[PDB]
Structure formats: C-alpha cells, structure tokens
Amino acid sequence: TYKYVNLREPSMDMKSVTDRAAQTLLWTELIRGLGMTLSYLFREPATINYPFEKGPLSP
Amino acid sequence: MINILMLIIPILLAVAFLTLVERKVLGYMQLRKGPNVVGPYGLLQPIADAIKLFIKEPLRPATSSASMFILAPIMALGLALTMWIPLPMPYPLINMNLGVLFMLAMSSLAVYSILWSGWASNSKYALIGALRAVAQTISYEVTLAIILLSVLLMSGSFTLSTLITTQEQMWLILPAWPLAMMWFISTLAETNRAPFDLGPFALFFMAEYANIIMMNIFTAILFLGTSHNPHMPELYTINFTIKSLLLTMSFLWIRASYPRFRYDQLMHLLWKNFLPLTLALCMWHVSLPILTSGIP
Amino acid sequence: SMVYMNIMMAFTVSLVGLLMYRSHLMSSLLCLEGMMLSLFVMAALTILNSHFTLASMMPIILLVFAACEAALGLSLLVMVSNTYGTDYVQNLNLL
Amino acid sequence: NLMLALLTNFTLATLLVIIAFWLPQLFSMKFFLVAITFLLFDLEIALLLPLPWASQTANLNTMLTMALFLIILLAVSLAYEWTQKGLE
Amino acid sequence: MLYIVFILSVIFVMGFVGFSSKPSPIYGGLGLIVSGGVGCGIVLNFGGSFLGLMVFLIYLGGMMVVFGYTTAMATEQYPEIWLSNKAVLGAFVTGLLMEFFMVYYVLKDKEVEVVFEFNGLGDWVIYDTGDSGFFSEEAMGIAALYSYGTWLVIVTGWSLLIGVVVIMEIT
Amino acid sequence: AERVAAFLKNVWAKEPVLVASFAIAGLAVILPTLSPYTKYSLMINXXXXXXXXXXXXXXXXXXXXXXXXXXXXXXXXXXX
Amino acid sequence: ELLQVLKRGLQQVSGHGGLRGYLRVLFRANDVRVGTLVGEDKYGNKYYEDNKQFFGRHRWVIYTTEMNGKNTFWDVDGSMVPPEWHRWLHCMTDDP
Amino acid sequence: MWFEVLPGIAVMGVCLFIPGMATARIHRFSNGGKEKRVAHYPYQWYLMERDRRVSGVNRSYVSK
Amino acid sequence: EYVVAKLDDLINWARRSSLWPMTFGLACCAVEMMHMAAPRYDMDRFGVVFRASPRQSDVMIVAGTLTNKMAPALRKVYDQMPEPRYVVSMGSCANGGGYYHYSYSVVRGCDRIVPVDIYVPGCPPTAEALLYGILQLQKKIKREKRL
Amino acid sequence: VLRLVMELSGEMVRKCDPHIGLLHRGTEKLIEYKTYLQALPYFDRLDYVSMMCNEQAYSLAVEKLLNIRPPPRAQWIRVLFGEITRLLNHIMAVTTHALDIGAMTPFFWMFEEREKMFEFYERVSGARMHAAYVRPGGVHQDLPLGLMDDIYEFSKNFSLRIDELEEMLTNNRIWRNRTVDIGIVTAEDALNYGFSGVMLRGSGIQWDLRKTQPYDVYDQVEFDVPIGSRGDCYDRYLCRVEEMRQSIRIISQCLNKMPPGEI
Ligand SMILES: NC(=O)c1ccc[n+]([C@@H]2O[C@H](COP(=O)([O-])OP(=O)(O)OC[C@H]3O[C@@H](n4cnc5c(N)ncnc54)[C@H](OP(=O)(O)O)[C@@H]3O)[C@@H](O)[C@H]2O)c1
Numbered sequence A: 001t002y003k004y005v006n007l008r009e010p011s012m013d014m015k016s017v018t019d020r021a022a023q024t025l026l027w028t029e030l031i032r033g034l035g036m037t038l039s040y041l042f043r044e045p046a047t048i049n050y051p052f053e054k055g056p057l058s059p
Numbered sequence B: 001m002i003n004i005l006m007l008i009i010p011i012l013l014a015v016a017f018l019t020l021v022e023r024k025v026l027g028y029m030q031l032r033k034g035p036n037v038v039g040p041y042g043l044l045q046p047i048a049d050a051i052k053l054f055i056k057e058p059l060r061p062a063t064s065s066a067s068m069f070i071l072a073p074i075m076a077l078g079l080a081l082t083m084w085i086p087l088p089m090p091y092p093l094i095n096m097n098l099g100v101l102f103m104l105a106m107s108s109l110a111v112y113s114i115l116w117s118g119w120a121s122n123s124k125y126a127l128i129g130a131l132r133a134v135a136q137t138i139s140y141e142v143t144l145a146i147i148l149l150s151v152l153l154m155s156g157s158f159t160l161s162t163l164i165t166t167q168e169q170m171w172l173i174l175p176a177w178p179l180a181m182m183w184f185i186s187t188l189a190e191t192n193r194a195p196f197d198l199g200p201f202a203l204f205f206m207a208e209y210a211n212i213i214m215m216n217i218f219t220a221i222l223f224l225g226t227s228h229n230p231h232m233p234e235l236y237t238i239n240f241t242i243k244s245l246l247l248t249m250s251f252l253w254i255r256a257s258y259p260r261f262r263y264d265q266l267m268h269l270l271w272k273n274f275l276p277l278t279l280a281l282c283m284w285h286v287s288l289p290i291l292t293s294g295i296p
Numbered sequence C: 001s002m003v004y005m006n007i008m009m010a011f012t013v014s015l016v017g018l019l020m021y022r023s024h025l026m027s028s029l030l031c032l033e034g035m036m037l038s039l040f041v042m043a044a045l046t047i048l049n050s051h052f053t054l055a056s057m058m059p060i061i062l063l064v065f066a067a068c069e070a071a072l073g074l075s076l077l078v079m080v081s082n083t084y085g086t087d088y089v090q091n092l093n094l095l
Numbered sequence D: 001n002l003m004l005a006l007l008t009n010f011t012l013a014t015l016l017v018i019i020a021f022w023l024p025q026l027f028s029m030k031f032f033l034v035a036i037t038f039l040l041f042d043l044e045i046a047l048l049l050p051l052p053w054a055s056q057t058a059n060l061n062t063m064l065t066m067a068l069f070l071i072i073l074l075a076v077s078l079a080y081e082w083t084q085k086g087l088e
Numbered sequence E: 001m002l003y004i005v006f007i008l009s010v011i012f013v014m015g016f017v018g019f020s021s022k023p024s025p026i027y028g029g030l031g032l033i034v035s036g037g038v039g040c041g042i043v044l045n046f047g048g049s050f051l052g053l054m055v056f057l058i059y060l061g062g063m064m065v066v067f068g069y070t071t072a073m074a075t076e077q078y079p080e081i082w083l084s085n086k087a088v089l090g091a092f093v094t095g096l097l098m099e100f101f102m103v104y105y106v107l108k109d110k111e112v113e114v115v116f117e118f119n120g121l122g123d124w125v126i127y128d129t130g131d132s133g134f135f136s137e138e139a140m141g142i143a144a145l146y147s148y149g150t151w152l153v154i155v156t157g158w159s160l161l162i163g164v165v166v167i168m169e170i171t
Numbered sequence F: 001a002e003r004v005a006a007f008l009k010n011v012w013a014k015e016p017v018l019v020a021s022f023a024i025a026g027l028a029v030i031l032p033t034l035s036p037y038t039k040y041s042l043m044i045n046x047x048x049x050x051x052x053x054x055x056x057x058x059x060x061x062x063x064x065x066x067x068x069x070x071x072x073x074x075x076x077x078x079x080x
Numbered sequence G: 001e002l003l004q005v006l007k008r009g010l011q012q013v014s015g016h017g018g019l020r021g022y023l024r025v026l027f028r029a030n031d032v033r034v035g036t037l038v039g040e041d042k043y044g045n046k047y048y049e050d051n052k053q054f055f056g057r058h059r060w061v062i063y064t065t066e067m068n069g070k071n072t073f074w075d076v077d078g079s080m081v082p083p084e085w086h087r088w089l090h091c092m093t094d095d096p
Numbered sequence H: 001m002w003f004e005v006l007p008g009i010a011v012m013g014v015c016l017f018i019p020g021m022a023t024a025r026i027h028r029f030s031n032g033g034k035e036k037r038v039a040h041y042p043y044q045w046y047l048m049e050r051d052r053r054v055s056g057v058n059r060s061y062v063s064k
Numbered sequence I: 001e002y003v004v005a006k007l008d009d010l011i012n013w014a015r016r017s018s019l020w021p022m023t024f025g026l027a028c029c030a031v032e033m034m035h036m037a038a039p040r041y042d043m044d045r046f047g048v049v050f051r052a053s054p055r056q057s058d059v060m061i062v063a064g065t066l067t068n069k070m071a072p073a074l075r076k077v078y079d080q081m082p083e084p085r086y087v088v089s090m091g092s093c094a095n096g097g098g099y100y101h102y103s104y105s106v107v108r109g110c111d112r113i114v115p116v117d118i119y120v121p122g123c124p125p126t127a128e129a130l131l132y133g134i135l136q137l138q139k140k141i142k143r144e145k146r147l
Numbered sequence J: 001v002l003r004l005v006m007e008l009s010g011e012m013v014r015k016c017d018p019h020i021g022l023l024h025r026g027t028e029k030l031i032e033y034k035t036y037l038q039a040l041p042y043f044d045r046l047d048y049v050s051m052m053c054n055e056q057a058y059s060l061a062v063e064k065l066l067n068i069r070p071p072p073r074a075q076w077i078r079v080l081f082g083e084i085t086r087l088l089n090h091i092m093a094v095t096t097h098a099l100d101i102g103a104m105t106p107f108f109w110m111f112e113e114r115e116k117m118f119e120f121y122e123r124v125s126g127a128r129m130h131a132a133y134v135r136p137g138g139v140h141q142d143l144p145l146g147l148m149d150d151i152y153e154f155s156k157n158f159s160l161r162i163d164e165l166e167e168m169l170t171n172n173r174i175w176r177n178r179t180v181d182i183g184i185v186t187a188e189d190a191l192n193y194g195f196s197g198v199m200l201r202g203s204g205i206q207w208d209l210r211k212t213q214p215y216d217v218y219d220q221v222e223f224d225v226p227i228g229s230r231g232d233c234y235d236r237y238l239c240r241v242e243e244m245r246q247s248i249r250i251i252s253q254c255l256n257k258m259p260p261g262e263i
C-alpha cells in the first residue's frame, strides 16, 4: 500500500546539515559499522563438529 | 652477529602464524570457527601449508621470460625483510643516521615486486590488471610521505630512536588527531585487499603479509610507545607486543567488514578527498612549532 | 683521481649510449636518466669531499630538474605511440 | 656493517627460490596521467623533506614564508587538476 | 677488502655497459636498479646519508617506476634476448674492454690516462678528510636550507607548476 | 548577506572536506602574524650554540666577563 | 565473574580423565566438553550427549577405537554409529 | 570461545616477542655493561675513537 | 626403509590438512556449495578456504550441470591446475546427469570430459553429505608413494 | 558461469553483450515426454533459490486448466511458504551481490539464518532445498505440529536479524558512493523491456501483481509495496530490504489465520 524509499534531502539549516557533514569529514558510520561486527564477535559461534556432532533432521 | 638470523626465522614464523589469526578472527567475525581438525586449536596448519605449497606443488610456466618470474620474488621477500633492520625495538640492529628515510624508500622500492610479476606473464590481460594494482600502490605513497613529514615536524628528527623520547607521557595520536585517521587508511596500500584487490603463489604473499606487520609496528612507534625505561627492556617489549597486535586485529577488521571501493572512486578518494585534507594539515603542521616554541 | 676515473668513464659510456641507436626510442630516455644519475654522483663527490655545506642543496635541485626533463619528454614519447603503432626511430615523416 | 645485514636477507630470499623451483619433481592512455602527477609531486615532497631538519637552526620569519609557499603551489597544481581531470 | 669506494665504482660502470649496449628497454631498465642502488653506496661512503638516500626515494622510488609504465605503454610484452641480437653483444663486449683492461693498469697504484690526472693509491687518501667538525657536521648534517637560498625555492616552484599544466595540454 | 550566508551552507552540504582544505590552511597563514608568541621561539633558536664559543681580546669593553657565573652577556633566561 | 569461568574450565578437564584424558580428546576430536553419557553401543562408542550447551545439542558421539578392523584412533569419520543416529544424534528425543 | 583465539595470539606473544628480547640480551655478550653506542654526528664518533685509544686497544666500550 | 615411509606420510598429511578448492558455480548445487561457508556446517574448521585462487587451487569441485557450451570451458581450467589435483563431482548432474540425462545439450556426467575421484550423490547435496566431499577425500589419501 | 563479452572504448563500457545460455539444460523439450505430476520437480530446478515461489506458478497454471480451486487451508500454506521463499530469495539477492562486490561479513551473517530457514523445509518435506511440495492438487503433505510454534519463534528473532543489514550496509559511505547512480532507468522504455520484478516496482511505476491480481487468498493479508524514486541500483537495493521487512507481517498474519481442515 505505497511505502516510499527516498527521504528527499532531510538537511535544512545548521543542526541538520553539520552532523550529516560530520560523517564525511570524520567517519562515525565506519565506527557504527564496526559496532555491529564487534557484538557479532563476542556471541558464541554456531558450529557443528561433523564426526561428533550432527545437524538436525526430519522424521 | 646472530641477531639478523633472529630477525628472519622468527619473523617468517609470525607471517606463517598470521594465516591462522586471519582465519580465526575473521572466522569469529563471521560466526564460523577457525581451524581445529589440524591440531589442538589448529596451531599445526602454518607448517602444514609450508609442506603443501613448496615441496609437491609444481609450477606450470605461462611463458617464463628468462630473467624475470625468478627475479620478482627477490624484490618481494628481500625488500620486506630489510625493512625490519632500522626498527627501534629497544636497541635496533645497526641504528641508521636517518631512520624514516630508509623506511619510506624501501617501501617505495617494494612497488617493483608487483611490477616485475606483471612482466612475468606474456598475456596482455595480466599486465593491464597489474598496472591497475600498481596505480593504487603508487598513489598512496604520496600521502605516506606527507603524513610522515607532518608527524616528524611536530617533534624529533628522521631518527627512529628520537620518536620514543617524544612519547614520554603523551602519545602522538592526540596532537595529530586527523592524521591518526589519515595514516591508518594510507597504510592500506600494498595490496591489502581491504580497499581494493587485483615464483609460486605461496612466497609472494609471504612478503605481502610481512608488510602488514611492518606497518602495524610502524604505527606502534609513530603513534604509540607510552615509555622507554632503559633499566628494564622487558617492560617495554611486553607492552609493545600488545599495542602492535591490537592494530594487527584492526587490519583484519577492515578486510572483514568493508567491501571494495570501486577502483575509480578509490582514485577519487585520493587527490579529491585525501590530498586537500593532508596538505591543509601539512600547512598547519608547519606553523605549529613557529606559533609555539618547539623545534627539537 | 681514483674514483673520478670511473664515474667520468661511466658518463662517456652513456654519452655513446645516447647517440647510438637500435630503433628503440625508450632506451634513449632511459639513458637520459643514467646521464643525470652520473652527473648526480660526480657533483656529490666534489661537494662532499671539499666540505661546502652550502652547495649540498644544489644536487637536490639538480635531482628535481632531472625528473622535469625525464617526464615531459617521456610524455611526448606516449604521443608517438598514440599517432603511430609502436615507438621507432625509423618511423618518421619529416624532411 | 650494513652490507652484512643486507646480503644475509637477499641470500636467504634467493635460497627460498631454489626450494621453490628445484625441489619439486613430477593500451589505455588515461592511466599515464597518474604516473605524471606522482613524479611531479615527489619532487615537491623532496623539497619539503628538510622541514624537521633545517628549522632547528635557521630563522623562522624567512622560512615560514617559503615553507608554506611550496605547499601552496602543491595545492595550486591540484586546483588546475580539478577542472576536467578524468573518469578514472 | 681494503678498498670501499673503488670496488663499487666498477659495478657502477658495469651497469652503464648495459646502456651503451641496447639489450631491450626491460633489461636496460634493470640497469637503473643495479647502477642506481650501488650509486647510493658511492655517495654514502664519503658521508651525507640524506643525499645518498635521495636516489632511493626519487630515482628508485619514482623515476624508473614511471619509466616502468611507459615500457608497458609502448614496446611491451616480450623483451628480445641480447645473446641473439646482433651488434648489441658487440657493443657490450667492447664496452667492458674499455674498463676491465684499464683496471689492470690501475694496479700498482698509478696509471696513464687520456686526461692528465693519475689513479693513485686510493686507500689512505680515499676519505680525504680528518676530523673537520663535531655536532651536526659532516657537510650534510644541515644540507638543504630555505634560508639564504630563497630565490632558488621560487624558481623550482615555477617549473613544477609548469610540469602539471603543460603535460595536461600535450595529452 | 548575498554569498556569506548563501555560499557557506551549500559548501557544507556539497563536499564539506573542501571547507577543511581552505579553513585549516587559512589559519596556518593568518595566525602566525597575529599571535604575540612567535618572538620567544626566535630567542632560544639563536641562543642554542651548535658551534664552539669564541673568545675576543678585550681592550676597554663593556658587557663581557669571565666564563663563571656573572652579570654579563646575553644568556637567555626566558621562563627558566 | 572471570574466576568462575576459569573454574568451569578446570572442572571440565578434571571430568573427562585428566592430564591424559583431556589431551586424548583434544587431539582426536575438535573440541572437548563434559556431559551426561548414554554409553550403550555395539563396538564401544561413547555418545555422551544430553547437555543443553548450544543449538542442536546432541553433542559428542565419540568414535570407537577399531570398530571392525580399521584402527580408528588418529583418523575417524562418520562411518560409525550403528542404528542409533535417528534418535541420539539427529531427529528423535528418546535414547535408543 | 577465547580458548581457541588467544592461543593464536600467545604464539605471536613468543615469535614477535623474540626480536625485542634478542636485540637487548645480545649486549650482555658484546659489552661488559649491556650497551652499544651510536654515532649519529661526528662528535660522538670521536668519543668512541678515543675510548678505543684509552686502556682497551681492541674494545670500544670500557671503563676508565 | 622405515624413515622414507614415515616421510611419505608427512607429504600426504600436508594435503590431508589443507585443501584449497576452485568451486564451479553454474548450478542449483552452487547454493549448497555456499552452505559450506554457512556457520552451521563449518568447513573453514578444516584447512579449506573460500579464497578460491583459480591458478593456485588444488581440488576443483564440479557442482551440477555441464552443458556442451561449458564442456570446453571446464577442460581448459583442469589443464591449468597443479599436478596434485582431485575432482569432486557434486550433485546428481555432475555424477551422470540426474535430470537432463536424455537431453541433447547436457554432457552425461563430467567423466566424459574430466576424470572424477570422489562422487557426491545427492541432488541438493546436503551439507551433511557434502562433508564426505572433504573428509572421505582426506581418508582416501593413502597414495602409497613408494619410489 | 557468464561469458559477458566487453567492448571497452578506454575505461568505460560502451557495448556489453551478455553471451548467455551457457546453462541450457533443455527443460523445454524434456518435459514434453513427461506427465504433469512427473514434470513437477523440473520447475523447482529452474531457479537456484525459489522452491515454493516456483512450482506455485506451475501448480496454479495446471489448476487454471483443470478449473479446480484448492482447499482453504492449502492456500494458507501456499502464502506462508510463498512468503518464506520471498524471504529466502532476497537473502541471496543481497548476500551474493555483496560477495561479488567484496563484502565478507554480511554473506555469513544471513547464511546461518538461511541454514535455520531450511530446517523448516526439511521438517515439512524430505529434501533440503528442491521440495516436490506445491502440487497441482494444492499441497501434498500437512505441516507437523512442531513447526507452527517454531515459525513464530524464528520471526521473533528475525526482527533483529534484518536490522543487522540496515545498521551495516545502508548507512555506509562506501555503498552510497558505489551503488548510487548506476543505470538510472525510470523511463517508459523499461515498460517496453518489461522487467516487472524489482526494476519497475523499485523505481517509479506503482504496478505490481500481488495487489492487482490475487492468486491464493490475498487482500485479506495486509501488504506494503516499496516504490523508489530513481532507477539506480541503490533504490533497487533499499526496496528489497523494505520487502524483507514487509514480509514478516504476511508470515505473522498467516500464523494468526490458519483454518483447520483438508490439505
Ligand atoms: N618411441 C619409443 O620410445 C619406442 C621405440 C621403440 C619401441 N618402443 C617400445 O614401446 C613401448 C612404449 O612404452 P614407453 O617407453 O612409452 O613406456 P614408459 O613411458 O617408459 O612407461 C612405462 C610404464 O610402465 C610401467 N612399467 C614398466 N616396466 C615395468 C615393470 N617391470 N614392473 C612394473 N611396472 C612397469 C611403469 O610404471 P611404474 O613406474 O609404476 O613401474 C611406467 O609407468 C616400450 O615398451 C618399448 O619397448 C618404444
């Protein structure tokens, strides 16, 4: 039922422009991209050791 | 003189054991597990790869152009190991008159390793693909020269031993705050796969992985150090190994997380985005020791 | 006296190497690099032995102007390979 | 000795090549402008090399006017590069 | 063994033998690596570490690297073997006999030459300097300076402005 | 404002790294002339003797004494 | 918190043998972990499972040393497990 | 878990730890004071030159 | 002698530890091939890496259907492979043509072009059954290289 | 896999002719000698990913010939599994696209989730992937009692799993530099080309198939169709991620509405 994708330029003046300009002068979104991968490292790996553990199956 | 042999064989082991850490850290970053079937925790695989790739694995020649193909690994492995010589690990192996000049030159001479390998194959598609990879290495050495010349301009001469004395209580990360971000990206130059990717295959990347450790230690001196302490060399070395390896994990982080930049846009990162920023900082770092007294 | 008998000899050998040709125009520009390299060493020895201190900057300036010619002349070589197929001394039109 | 440090690295590098070979038994003119810009910038960096080396003794009022001037023309060259550079 | 500069000077000319001879631009390109790298050592032996490493940074870290591009742009793929090439080996054999035959006469110190200057011993007078200075000395401790030579900085800047603009107008 | 307010916020929106290239390099030129702190750096730079000192033969001369601590000569004592 | 996790690792080594027990499990199997044992199998297979651990936790079906005449001590695959794989290893809940 | 990853770091805490210790411990054998001096500028070289002239003719670093 | 026989075990163990594959896509099988990378059935737990490296690679895994158009394409790749090489036919198409056996355009199961060492039988070759493309291959390396 | 003959004028591509059909298995002539029930698993093996989105198009086409409406419950299985394929198809549409570019992490992040997704296929049908399940007679076999609780439990955990991609790939400076402005096609020429999938739907044209022509119990299930602004790859990417977000709502409404009866 008609969703949209584009935001059509959210920046207007001073406060909404400089923070969008901040993620190009310095990075921040790279640190935000680092954050999701950091939490992904600390959670336990879901691995099955084949000759000893076996994958789930059906009847 | 046993020290040179104590900076080749355990150094090549660090390159060999890198392949495990690259597979295990990136592994845990991808929810899979590292090597385990090989040894106790896969620790017996770096020697297992050495027996596999060298002894029984042969080379089918594409053309073998007499002098080349055998000359390119000498420029690869040889120049990567000579970089270890002037490094200020407590008391360096024959301390240079100018440290960083030898560091910047042998890294810029390491460009030939990928150049001569481009000449090694007769096919035109290989050399055009090779020159594209040279273009990445050639461009980021301009920024590598600029950032170095602005860091040294703050404190110290070209000697690497004086770079320890300036970081007695304060790291060079904080005064060179935009340069700390800048140098970290510019180190990804010698085919690091994180920004963009292009004798036998085995020993060729043994030099490329060695350059990654080389830049990791070079960051750990120019930006890190904490103290020196001439009384105990042990307290510095334990502290240095933690600082260097924390930056080694970060090169395994950028490769894991981020896709290729598009070659053209990677060349648009330089000249258009990086070079206007670094030269403005280079202008700024000229004025700083003149504005406030500090010319050692 | 001792060293100058070799580096002057290397200059005269490169002087022959420039004017002698085997159709390749790339090799002449490569020898122009060697000519400036031989001039670099010959200037370095004269300034470093007789402690000038002021004249030490001069071969550094000479090194800059070495690369000025060995790039702008090299760019013209590319223009020959744009108009013609491959760079050759034999491939000419001027009378 | 520096030659003792160099030769030992190169001889063991060539020794690995001996193991690598003997032991087993069974176009585009646009990229040229990159090399041109690189070489021309190297010399400006080479002129800007003695900055943390000559500033220790020499007068600062004479140097600062000249030191920035080299970086200015290094950016002015890039200002000419911005107007139609290339697709690459 | 006793000589330092004289042994390296022979290898320096040996590189230039491959320039008088024309063994294809690829093998001739290898000459600038051999003679250039040894050419640093000749400068380094008398002193001045900065000026010796300038060849490493510019000639070996730029000049021949850019010359590596143009070899791929024109006259590329395969270099022809110099053993098969006519007169190229003839220029190589005559080139070495102008140097190697001379070295035999340099033995027993003094030698006759085309110029009036003689060879000499080149072992005790090889350095040609005693103590001279002390701190920040050796002539190239303070080598390059923006002070005094203010005029030379401007004109170098002018030519490097020309280089970027002109090559853009050519291509 | 015609271009002071207009052609500044547009530069923040369209390539804000170009703002840093003119501002930081601009402050590198203007600030050294304005600050009254550059005079101290020139004083110690001339005071630091790299070469050996030379003694002059005095015949009725002022502001010169023996090598021991005495109220004579320059001898910079700017902030200890 | 860190002392409690270290004590759990030391108790795990003490559970399955000891100095010779845990070292034999680390070399033959991928990972060593302690749990409740089922035991009963033709040609002495351990099949020590029942633990909660993680996802799909019918863990550790340790292969018997020489099942028929292969001497499976250093090298062993999924060739073992006689008619019990459908319950104790994969699909069903109850022990065979 | 980290009983697998950290042994990969601990092995690097030996091999990469060697060059720092090997360069430091070697001065015990080369010198009777665990120190080697670097010239940098001709003044410090002349001090090393007269140190070989005094007492110990062959040795560079010696007391008195 | 006994010393030579134990040395030949070490050469065999070098391949038994690590196998670097050039996995051919061109199949519905290719998704199940990508399920080796999937953490649940981990394969980087072995000495196997998804870096591929076409010229360097040892064990090319031919996954699924081979048409007459791709028939000369796969053969020239196999010739460029280093001498210690193995071929794993993954899926019923790669074995003898599961479907499309009686079709005009499909080659009847890899062996007519390139010799196969280990056959993986299943259409969707389950990541359970696909770990016999590694472990059974590693088990099969005895070779008995005497002289 | 693909030939792709490139004509490079200098650096930019001028004439890109994809010399495709390198996998012509010959499904066209081979089905002619098979019956309708016999030719069913061929259309599973048409695409690599779709299993219940495939066969769905075939079984309904046989139903249109036979004039037979499938039972009410079977249609609700057809949507529940039809949308779980729509979830499965857009995993590969993002991950292998990221794998072709050079992104290492987001491929593995979804493939553990994807291996948990095939557990639903395994418990409902004997095969891992290609399941002969959607048949001309509606649905072959009923859902087991264990699965219906596990579908909700997965969708509860999928909420954060889809949020992983938008906190990683969409906000990147690299992606907004790369994927933005490649082949901007919004024109009425795209109608003449007739992509219909994500090209027309993800740029300009509002038209889709799910809303206009109902196939198996639609209009009852709520939908949000994402439509972009420009014809670039990035707008075509974001609409697919928004399709992935607006698919759990269909799954949850399928969980709420299950009429008990014949299969
Ligand atoms: N063009 C010619 O060279 C030429 C000319 C005139 C006549 N011929 C005749 O034609 C034949 C051509 O064969 P070829 O020379 O091409 O063969 P070949 O390349 O020398 O290969 C011989 C193979 O046979 C096996 N073999 C040979 N003798 C064996 C033994 N006593 N026990 C076990 N295995 C043995 C070897 O396997 P293992 O390594 O496992 O033992 C080896 O792989 C020859 O027999 C020759 O008499 C040839």
Ligand code: SF4
Residues within 6 Å of the ligand: I027, I028, I029, I063, I064, I065, I090, I091, I092, I093, I094, I098, I099, I122, I123, I124, I125, J045
């Ligand atoms: S064996 Fe099955 S899954 Fe594999 S390519 Fe053939 S039809 Fe597709």
